[PDB]
Every structure is written in C-alpha cells, then in structure tokens.
Write a protein that binds this ligand. Structure first.
Ligand SMILES: [Mg+2]
Lengths: 524, 524, 75, 74
C-alpha cells in the first residue's frame, strides 16, 4: 500500500483543521445551556443531541491527516473519561485551545521543544494548584452530598451510594441492577470483581454502557490458552441446551476460537463472552481457583490432564449476573456455597502467617479481600419502566462521580476551577522566552471551558471570565442560573480527578502534535 | 464513513430549505378545500391526494441537511398525531411558521437562546388560554356530539361511541371490527388491552392503520426472554398445521428468533407476531398469568422447569381477534372460561384487602379492571363492502377524536382557536427585546393555519383573519361554507389535545432548530 | 463620514468611521426585527441632536499652553 | 470599545468599568489604568468629538433605510 507522506508544516496544518472540526462540533454543547448538534442516522429521522460524546463519536473526516488530527484528539479525550467518568468534551475543548495557540507559535518560528516544556510546566503547576483548591469528600454526609448533586438534586440517590460505601467500603465493588418493585434495595452478596476486559467489542449486548451483561450464566474456568473451538464443542452444546449464556475465564482465547465465538453471538446462536484470567504466572492459578470456589466451579488445569472435551455442566461455575467492560469483569452473586467460600478464606488467611515478604503479603490480602469482601448490589426501583431505567442510569452516573470525588475531592465545576488555577500561576516563567509562550498558551487555554460555557449560554465570555478571576477559591459563575457565588455551595462541582484528567490528557495530545514532524497514511 | 460537517449559519440555512419543502408540499392540503398533490408511484398511474399525512410520508430530499431539516419536522409532527389523533399537518404548518421567522431573527444577529425563551413563553401562555377557550365534553350527549361531528354529520357513529363509553367507561378498551350484516352491533366481551407494541414493523399486515390484525390466533404466554428459534420449532409446527396465526407474549424476543419470525411472515410461511409482556419485575408474572386466565392459556415459566420444546397447542391461549400497534396490544374475546375468569377476580379482589400500601393498591385495581372490565367491540355494518370499510374507517376516526375530547375538551376547529388565543396574549412581553421577537414570531405563527385554510380555498387570508380576530370565544370562519359563526355550533371543532399537541410539538422542533449549531451527516 | 469628518476638523476620521459602522450594524439589525427604518432614523437623529447639546455642556475651554500641548500630543 | 480592542484587552470589561464611574473617569489605554482623563491630559477637541458623531450619524441614518439598490452588471 503506497503512502502519502506529509512534513513539518503541512503535517501540522492538516492536523490542526482535523482537530478544529472535532472541537467546533463538539464544543457547542458544553454548558448546562449547550446548543444542539444534528446527527443524521441512515434510515429514519435525524438525531438531535446536546451530548458531546455522541457528537465526537460520529466525527470522521475525508482528508486523511485532517482526519488523523481529529481521531487523535478523540482518542485521548476518551481516555480522560476512561479514567475519570467525564470530561471527554472538556478534554477536547482544552485540547483545541493548546493546539491552536501552540501550533501558531511553532509556525511563527519559535521552538516546539520549548513550547511543549512551558505547557507541561503550566500543567504540572496547575494540577498542584487544583489539589489545593480541592475540597475533600470523605464522610458519609459528603458522599451523599456529591451523589445527590451528581444525580440531579435527588437525595435518595445520594443516600443509596453513601449506604453502599458504608457497607463494603469506599473500595468495595458496587453494582446496579434493574429494580423489581417500586422500592430501592441494597444487598451485599458473595461475588468479586477483577481488572480484565472483554476479548472483543462484539460481545457487547448493551451498547449505551458499551458493556456485556449476562444473566444467570454458566462460567468456564479453564487454566490454559484456548485456541481451537474443537476443544469447546461438548461444553457449548450442553450450555446451548440449558438455554443459558456462558462466560469463559481462561488464560486467553485466541484467533480461531475467538473470531468463532464472536460470529456465534453475532447471529445469536449461543450468547457467550470471554475474558482473560486475572493476574499472571504463579499467582494466576491461585486467583483462578478463587473464582472457582466463589461460583462452585471446577478449574480445568491442563497440568493435571483434563481437556475441555471432558467437561460437562457440572464443571462450569455459576453466578446470578456478570458484567464486563472495556477493562473490568465483575461477578455478582456466585452459587458456590459458604461451607467452601469461608473454608478458602481460612486457607488463605493462614498463608499470610507463612509470609516472609511484604509483596507476598498484600497479594494475599487483596485475595482475601475480593473473596470474603463481597459485592454490593443496588436495585433501582421506580413507578414506570421509563422512569426506572432512567433513574438506574443516573444512579450509575452518580456512583461514578462519587468514586471519583472520594479519591481526589471536588472543585468548582463551571470551568471555574481551571479559570482559578490559571490566574494563580500567572507569574510562571521558564528559560526560553519560548517556554514562556509555552506557559501562557497553556494558561490561557485553561479559560477555554468557562469562556465556552458562557458563550453557549449566549452571554459574554470576557465579562464572566474577568469577574470569575476577580474572586478566590470556588467563587464562580453558575451559567444555569446566571448567579455568581461559591460554585460548590451552589451545587456546581466536578471531581478533582476529572478536571485534572481532562487537563492532563489534553496537554498530552497537544504536546504530541506540536512535536510532530511527519505523518504517514494511505493514498486517497 | 467520512462526514460532512456544517456550522451555525450554513447548517441552519440547509435546515430551513429542508423544512420549507416539507411544509410547502404539505400545507397546500390543509383546509376542507385543499389542493391536490400528485404523488408518483412506481408501476402504474400516479396518486392524486389531498391528505397531508400521505404527502409528508413521501417527502425525502437529495441534499442531506436539507433532508435532515424536513425529516426532523416530519418526526415531531408525527408524534403530535401519535399523542392526539390529528394535527400532523397543522403541526407542520406551524413548525414552518416559527422556524422561518425565528431563523430569520437569528440570522439578523439576535440571540437564539432568548428567541427560544420568547416562543416557549408564548406557547406556554396560549396553551393555558386554550384550556380556557376549551369547552368540556363529558356527558353522553357531548360524547355523541363530538363523535357525530368527527364522523362527518353521521349521528349513528356518535351514538355507537357514546354507547360503548357508556358500557365499559370513558377508559374501557373499545375496538372496531368489520361488520357482518347491514346492522351495526355493540358487544362487550372478555378481553383486555395492554401498553406494549409490535417488536418489528414487518409484522404489520394492514399498512393504512400501520397495525397488525390477527384472526382467531393462538397465544403463546411465555415467561422468559426468547432468543433462539430452536425453542420454538415444535410450537410453530403445531400452529402451522392448525392453519392459524400466533401471538407471542413473552418477556421479550431477541435478535435471532426475532429476525427469524420476521422473515417467516415476510414470505408468509406462518403469519406470526410478538410483543413484550406487560409490566416489569414482580408484577409482570402476575399480569402474564392474567392473560393466561383470560385466554385459557398455560403460562410457560422457566422457574418451574418447562421449556418451549415441551408445549403443544393445549398450552397456547386463544382469542377471536388481536390488534397491535406501534405501542398497544389488544386482545379481543378470549376463550378462557368464566368459571376461571371470575375466580381470578375473586382471588385478586382479596389481594386488595391484604394491601398495606397505596401503590400496591392501584396496581391491583388496574388488574381487576383490565380483566373483569372487558373490551367493547363495535361491528360496523353497511350495504356494500366499499361503504363498510369506509364507514369502519370514520368510526375509528371519531373514536380517536372522542377519546381525545373527553380528556381535554374541544375548541374552534378552523385554525380559529389558535387565532384567538393569539389575539388574547398580544401584550405579552419578555426581558430581552430579543425575547419579545421570540414571543411575536410565536404569536404570529399561530395565525398560520387559519391563513392557510383560507388561502387554499382561494379566499383572502388577511381579511378573514382580521374578522375572526374581531370576534370572541369560538366565533370563526367556516371555510367550507364561507360563513362566520360559532365554530363549535357550526360543527367545525378540534379536540383540545390535538390543537395543543400540534402547537407544542411545532414549537419544540422550532426551538431545537433555532438552537442548532452543528450538523453531521454522510458524504454526498 | 470619514471624508467629511476630515474637511471639517482634519481629525477624528477613524472615530467617525467607527461610529457609523456601529450605527449601521445595530440599525440594520433592527430593520430585520421589522421596525420601520424611517423611524429608526428619526430616533437615531433625535438621540444625536441631544448628544450634541450634551457635548456642548461638557466642553470646557482649552486656553493655556499646557492644554494645547495635550491636544497636540494626543493627536 | 475599539480603543480597547486595539490594545488587545477586553472591550466590554473596560467599557463596563468606565460606565460604572462618573464625569471624566476613563481608561488610559496607554498606561492601562483608569483615572481622570482631563488630569491625565487625554483631551479630544470637542468640535471633533462632535463632528464624528454628526457625520457618522447623518449617513449611517440614511443608509439603514435602503430597501433597493441599483448598479451595473458585473
Ligand atoms: Mg486622531
């Protein structure tokens, strides 16, 4: 495939437009008073939306290059959200702001390497400043606080989160299910969560969480790499007959059998999903054994001479629900009995006595944790189906912002925090007067979100911005009600994680681009 | 798929043309004196029609964008109809009226956010005003009144509706069947109706109601999610042999089995339809059981160990007719015996005594209602087949307007009611002089329909408009007979629901548009 | 405007321009709101005849050498 | 508002604080500080301030009452 190669300036100009199109389409939706974007949709009527993440997802441009620009900003703004629960649009908005001004600088004939340095300093410094502005959220009161605000003034959401954290801890694995009455319920139950994701996006059966949700599935617990679907066919037949879905948790599932199970749930013959096993090497086999104990399954270890050709249902583990992500598997209510589950904790307990190293310790206590610690399920109740799966949705929104608030606190939500931190470090210097521009570019980039919210509202940016800067702490402008005040008191807050992650992630891709010299791609 | 992105002004201009084309094709048919639109039809001779809903249906433009414009207005105007039984065209005609004027404003350099505010106030205000102009329709007299008017001066249609409501209540489920004599008949019969719709539009066998009509069908009452067509094949074989259609009322029917039954009624091998079960969670299983009792079917609950592989005809329920919509299922004359049906009411009756909550109460009485309350069937009689299925059509038209009148009353039909409410709130102000323009645009929009009817008739708008405005209450101009009078007395009325829905829905989409900043779509 | 400004006082031509660009912008915007432009004018004028009196009232004589130097300098 | 824009600060912030004062309070663009403009010796000759308003208005006025425009083919 012959390529089209672009250099230095051409490269960066293509890049820039690319990014502007992403940013102009996505940024107009930022406020509590964003504008609509109309997103055509093949058959039927277009979609009108104010949700940046929807707008983003659709942007792809004709000009490769331009496209590569826009795809790069998308990539990283999506990670911001990956790590924080939010900011995807903010990250994009800031990303433009740096790229634009930095990219002008390079083109004016200043030094890219220094502009990056400056920006990077300005970020480092403001991330600190954010830590300082940050108001902790630690007690049950504060937990319910950020939950209720994050779930839109609904006090009962705040409560339920507060209560869950209260039962399984601020770590504790907490999930949400569809509710069966009008009543909310909170139950702790045997289960577990581990940091492995689906092996193919095509397993997803609920694309709005971009996640897989299996009901009452059998669980295969194979300790080996699954390559051929041949090994599978006795188990997949017993499963298809019990009319239930199946989770594979093996070392891995590769090429053949993978692309097989994929096209097997594509046409919906047997719904299946597979994820790598937790951990690696020596502590893998122990950790797989744990999930066995949890779901009353049998581990199929090739190191004792058992093939998957010799496995009937009786071997498969079993749980009342399982939910997988991009990068998380969480098993809810495992049928494996307490006679066993406790007995295993008593085994692992003792392994901690015969620990002679510290790394061998935490690794055994993270295991005792996952296992005896449990998973807290919230059932969201409501009057009507619509209400319910809307409330359910907000419950997951808040749970997200709260887990976030716990870790790093909250700060002025309006754009405010970034406006603030930037007026604080407005002495900042570097050594090149090139790094100075770097720092300024970055600083003035940080106004972008506030200026944008205001703009969208149809008020004057410069004016609101200047008066937010005049103040201190979390004094800000609440675009929704047009009143200045203490943004936090007024219930307009972002987790610290999320404003930071936005900024860092914007800065990264902006540096990347200000230091790009070449761009390779396919021929038009 | 690379997109084509258009901003602010461009976007809006494209939208505007898009919406005009829809409106100018559609609006010439509005009056009792509309003009014809010719709608080409592939093989054979074209279609001449005066029916805005037909013209709309055909509108799709080449320029995406422009097309998006038209598609959005169609979307929303069709929901008006969805919620009221009429106004599809009016909603479009008002939609254009705001969009045109508000969109000129934005372009002139006034503030979108305020213009929307203004319009929305003017609407809010006139919706109230409408409630005031509204004359209730409550007693048997009034019911037959709006029925007869709505069925075109035919007093017998008014009667039959009046009589049905009179037997099963202004709520009670009332349907219409083809008549078998020259005589109309009214019968109440064991049956029921619940708020769930077809799972695929391809089930529709009578596209002019956009609805599915099955005759003497067996009913599968499965309590589970149906994924595989494997589970089905014994029951679909017994059903195909009895040469009768089949209704599935299971928790759901998914991907595989769904797209299967779909292509199974496409080539017409077995006519089938499936709809989700009523309600969710705990009260679902009870509610499914009720339909069982009603049709003497057996509920197949996986929670007792019964597969669909073990179900012969003897399990399927049975009713003399069933009709499904976009969003309604209604089961007419269930064979399930009165020994059982009454017994079930006596059971549920008692559950109300052992109610300790209010939500647990209404939920049990909505169940006693649906079941012992029954379904009232009108059979439309006539002399010839043509007459009959034309009369049958007007009977459903009136039934619609009546159900609607009941809920919110009737008002001056001629466009009048809007013309009136508008001349009432002609002081209205906002705060921006921008919002003022908003309110005016909106108000002056409200004349559109009257002006258009008059215009279609080939009389002078300005002049009839001015004289309708000079009057009060429901004095208006009856375009069909060119006489001013009391629109309601003269038999030219619109259910309150329908004039309001039309307005609100046109205002929504206009706001939406006046506040759209970006427009994404595929490349030409 | 710019030309006349200049035959009249040989200064302020940019301001003048700036003002007209401004009356016009705003005025046309109100013609699109559907005001009667002949009235827009009458108002603009009335506004102005008023503003001129106002100016003649703020004016204070410039008659020392210092002030004269300041107008020079600023010009 | 243009004086201020030409310095690359924000016209509506400057105009607002100027508007918030009295008599000859105004913004010294050169020194970027507020104060009394007479004392700072930032004097415009009245006859100019006045002619700029008069002439600008005189034509702008007519201009916004254009409804048709006649001219040559390109
Ligand atoms: Mg000068």
């Amino acid at each position: 495939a012959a390529k089209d190669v672009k250099f230095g300036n051409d490269a960066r100009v293509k890049m820039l437009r690319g990014v502007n199109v992403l940013a102009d389409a996505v940024k107009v939706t930022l406020g509590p008073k964003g504008r609509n974007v109309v997103l055509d949709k093949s058959f039927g009527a277009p979609t009108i939306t104010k949700d940046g993440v929807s707008v983003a997802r659709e942007i792809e441009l004709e000009d490769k290059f331009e496209n590569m620009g826009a795809q790069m900003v998308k990539e990283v703004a999506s990670k911001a959200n990956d790590a924080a629960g939010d900011g995807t649009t903010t990250a994009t908005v800031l990303a433009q702001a740096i790229i634009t001004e930095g990219l002008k600088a390079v083109a004016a004939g200043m030094n890219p390497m220094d502009l990056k340095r400056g920006i990077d300093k300005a970020v480092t410094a403001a991330v600190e400043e954010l830590k300082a502005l940050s108001v902790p959220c630690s007690d049950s009161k504060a937990i319910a606080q950020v939950g209720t605000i994050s779930a839109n003034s609904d006090e009962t959401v705040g409560k339920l989160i507060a209560e869950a954290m209260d039962k399984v801890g601020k770590e504790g694995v907490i999930t949400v299910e569809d509710g069966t009455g009008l009543q909310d319920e909170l139950d702790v139950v045997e289960g577990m969560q581990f940091d492995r994701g689906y092996l193919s996006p095509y397993f997803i059966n609920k694309p709005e969480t971009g996640a897989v949700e299996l009901e009452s599935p059998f669980i295969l617990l194979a300790d080996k790499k699954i390559s051929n679907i041949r090994e599978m066919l006795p188990v997949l037949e017993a499963v298809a007959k019990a009319g239930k879905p199946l989770l594979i948790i093996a070392e891995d599932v590769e090429g053949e059998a993978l692309a097989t199970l994929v096209v097997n749930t594509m046409r919906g013959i047997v719904k299946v999903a597979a994820v790598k096993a937790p951990g690696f090497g020596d502590r893998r086999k122990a950790m797989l054994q744990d999930i066995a104990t949890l779901t009353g399954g049998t581990v199929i270890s090739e190191e004792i001479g058992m093939e998957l050709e010799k496995a009937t249902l009786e071997d498969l583990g079993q749980a009342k629900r399982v939910v997988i992500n991009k990068d998380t598997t969480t098993i809810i209510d495992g049928v494996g009995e307490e006679a066993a589950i406790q007995g295993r904790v008593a085994q692992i307990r003792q392994q901690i006595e015969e620990a002679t190293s510290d790394y061998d310790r935490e690794k055994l206590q993270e295991r005792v944790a996952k296992l005896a610690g449990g998973v807290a399920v919230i059932k969201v109740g409501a009057a009507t189906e619509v209400e319910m799966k809307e409330k359910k949705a907000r419950v997951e929104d808040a749970l997200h912002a709260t887990r976030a608030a716990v870790e790093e606190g909250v700060v002025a939500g309006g754009g405010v925090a970034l406006i603030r931190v930037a007026s604080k470090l407005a002495d900042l210097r570097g050594q090149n007067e090139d790094q100075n521009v770097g720092i300024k570019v970055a600083l003035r980039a940080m106004e972008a979100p506030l200026r944008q919210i205001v703009l969208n509202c149809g008020e004057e940016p410069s004016v609101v911005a200047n008066t937010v800067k005049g103040g201190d702490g979390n004094y800000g402008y609440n675009a929704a009600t047009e009143e200045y005040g203490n943004m936090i008191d007024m219930g307009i807050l972002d987790p610290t994680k999320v404003t930071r992650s936005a900024l860092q992630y914007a800065a990264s891709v902006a540096g990347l681009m200000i230091t790009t010299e070449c761009m390779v791609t396919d021929l038009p």
